[PDB]
């Protein structure tokens, strides 16, 4: 009984960990993507000025 229950808790907590990591770090990826796009836009504007 104790074998079974310990294994179940182990697996469940590990799954929760994995889901949280993947979700949040995907959000980070797209955020910095947006930053890159904005910076490229301002650079283009300056070039047109010149």
């Amino acid at each position: 009984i104790r074998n079974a229950e310990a294994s179940r808790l182990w697996a469940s907590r590990l799954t929760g960990d994995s889901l949280r990591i993947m979700q949040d770090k995907d959000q980070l990826i797209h955020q910095m993507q947006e930053g890159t796009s904005r910076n490229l836009g301002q650079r283009l504007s300056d070039l047109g000025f010149w």
Binding site: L40, G41, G48
Partner: protein
């Protein structure tokens, strides 16, 4: 003329919508010393011309 070439290059790169043509796994591109200057120097060359 050189800076117009530059603007067109930057345009078809930032304004390029992905998933379409440039989906090759480029690698080894994490190193490039092609840039010889710092934008302030470029600006002062332009001012010198003026």
């Amino acid at each position: 003329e050189d800076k117009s070439s530059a603007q067109y290059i930057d345009e078809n790169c930032f304004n390029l919508r992905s998933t379409s043509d440039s989906i090759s796994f480029f690698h080894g591109v994490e190193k490039f010393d092609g840039t010889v200057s710092i934008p302030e120097t470029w600006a002062k060359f332009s001012n010198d011309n003026i």
